[PDB]
Amino acid sequence: GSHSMRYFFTSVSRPGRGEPRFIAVGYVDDTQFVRFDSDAASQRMEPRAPWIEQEGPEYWDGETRKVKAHSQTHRVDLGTLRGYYNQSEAGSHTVQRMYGCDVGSDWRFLRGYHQYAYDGKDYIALKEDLRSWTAADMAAQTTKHKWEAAHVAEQLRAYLEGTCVEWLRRYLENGKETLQRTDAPKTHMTHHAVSDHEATLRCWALSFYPAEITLTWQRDGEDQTQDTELVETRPAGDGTFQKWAAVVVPSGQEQRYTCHVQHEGLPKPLTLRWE
């Protein structure tokens, strides 16, 4: 019954092709609810879930003002990081920021986070105490010194423990039909010969929410993790998720193999069998 609110920012430079493109998205759990795209015509924070549409004009104006301000700072950051790393303008670079808060089943604060990456690598992250920073290299130590002297952590901690949690709870209530639901996976296994002597066994989970799930194969009760092909959990497009796991086995041995599904929607974990 645990929940999260997260915001994700990506800014990408495009040398000699204009200013950087900035995209921001916001999620409650695995449900997107807002977006902003600096290239788009509207120049507005836009709704992406039905339950956020009821927020009033002060909300949309304020969310737009804040995200535009972040768009500009991440533009400046791409410049700053080229300076920190002595990089040229021959190539494109990427800054990412992610932040948000988690609450438990009882909706009380669990933990907060705020992390930044440059070119796909950790750059600087707020520690669990929300008071101190982890800087991944020497350039990020420069940022750490500046953020310590500017008391950035204190600002974030007040947001993460306060405002973040309060608005997460508001969204959970307003979007309760979507966000408080659990859709248990509909499960089955498929069998297809790959030759006269081997078969692919594929364990499916469909139509589930939230996206967290575990699918595993056992052979006589022993986990077959090195022999399993496990695909990334994927969106169906309707607010639910899908996932599969496959093993290739000698024909005749199917009854040794079982698939095991764990999900919060299931009253008990399922074991699927070939007998």
Partner: peptide
């Protein structure tokens, strides 16, 4: 609701 203070790397 996002945070509203800004900072630079």
């Amino acid at each position: 609701l996002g945070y509203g203070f800004v900072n630079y790397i």
